[PDB]
Structure 1
Amino acid sequence: PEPLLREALGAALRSFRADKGVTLRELAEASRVSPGYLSELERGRKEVSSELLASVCHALGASVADVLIEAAGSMALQAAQEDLARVLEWSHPQ
């Protein structure tokens, strides 16, 4: 289906972190959560509290709004790509 919110936000957070060149353990330290927890968050396997999303975004020098737009853009793209892949597999299989 449409990607879940936590999957989209996790990937967006990961992109922002990679953009800034900040390691996961550094970002988890700035946000006061374990590196494992943040790793799971990035992988779409954990639901963030709004408070923790705010700390992680702030630590990255990003507004939460910017991370939401990133997440929404990639959600739509991912749905469209998976749609395109089904349409083509049906009409042009290998």
Structure 2
Amino acid sequence: MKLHERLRELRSERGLRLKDVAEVAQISVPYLSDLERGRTNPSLETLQTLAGAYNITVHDLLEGVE
């Protein structure tokens, strides 16, 4: 799947709101939405921060992403 699709899946599967995540990750809601829509590409550092919000590793986060 696309990385954006994976980001969206990780949130949705955990039943979390954008606002909840964004607050933890210290990013804006619209940036996270853009990430999940594939309108902007995340850096590695961003992936680390989201992985921490989802209680996973970046290794885990990328599973399923070709």
- Alignment TM-score > 0.5, same fold: yes
Structure 2: gaps (5+ residues): none
How big is the shift at 1:19?
1.0
Higher helix share: 1
Structure 1: gaps (5+ residues): 73-94
Runs (4+) off by over 4 Å: none
TM-score (norm 2): 0.89
Alignment of 1:52-71 (within 5 A): 52-71=46-65
Task: Provide the identity percentage.
Answer: 36
Structure index of larger Rg: 1
TM-score (norm 1): 0.65
Greater relative CO (CA pairs within 8 A, separation 6+): 2
Match of 1:46 among 19, 40, 49: 40
Size of the alignment, in residue pairs?
66
Match of 1:14 among 8, 15, 19: 8
Q: Deviations over 1:57-76 (max 9, x none)?
A: 1110121112212222xxxx
Task: Report the aligned-residue RMSD.
Answer: 1.3
